[PDB]
Amino acid sequence: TAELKICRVNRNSGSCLGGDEIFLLCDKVQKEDIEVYFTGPGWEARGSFSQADVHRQVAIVFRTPPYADPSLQAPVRVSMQLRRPSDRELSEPMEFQYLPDTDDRHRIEEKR
């Protein structure tokens, strides 16, 4: 069976609020049997995308999920990896850094 592997991403950091579009290049996958699994100490979540979002089975465009803590005050490093519901296989993890929300959040909360 093909192995799961993330070859490259356009960015490795984003808002703790989630919603950041990520372009991910990988080895051959099956569009109906693949997901982007985010994990950290006591936290799990998946990227958001549809099958139409899997390009020639070698690329995926997805939006990052919101982090556990929306009022993050400092960058938090988590893991990003490909997951196959099929056999529960996982690719080698890739670092992803969640960042605090700029303005409005914490800004109106004793900062500004």
């Binding site: 991403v9 490795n12 960058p75």
Partner: protein, 220 residues
Amino acid sequence: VFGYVTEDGDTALHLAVIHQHEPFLDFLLGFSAGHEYLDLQNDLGQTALHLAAILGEASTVEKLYAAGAGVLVAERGGHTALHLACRVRAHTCACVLLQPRPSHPRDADEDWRLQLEAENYDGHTPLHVAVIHKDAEMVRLLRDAGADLNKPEPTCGRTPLHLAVEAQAASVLELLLKAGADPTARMYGGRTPLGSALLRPNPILARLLRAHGAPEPEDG
């Protein structure tokens, strides 16, 4: 303590450096020293130090540094003052930062090395930036400062050597090589610096890697 701020979030300090007014700067620092006032970030997330670094003013960076300005604070792009220096070839500024803070301000975790591996939001440490910008002089300062010459950036695991090859900066590639950067490192895909250099135009790069014991690439 004074607390004026512009529409851009710039305090009297930010404006002292923006206007390059050493005399007023000295005045401000006369009190600021040790306060949190020094690390206040305008709306771009920049502190006075960041501004001084961008301007490439080694003398101004020392005053701020001597006064106790935070050296790990990051602006909007996650850039520390050292990161910014590496973008504008501010060699002398990097030098001021790359050593123990000056003793006492100016009256007529305290490891400065934590700056070396600080990473911005692009997943870049200062060395990555110096190489991306084909800055041999800056690479030298970072090397001597003890920067990690093998540190992979996170989009696809490129090491400093991979970046130098992408930058087609042969002299930088060599500096890295002579300093012992492991030419056997592969990015997430599996490609090595040599393998990468082969798909590049400038022949020098491949020659260097070869000359420094870089194993030959594995097909494709």
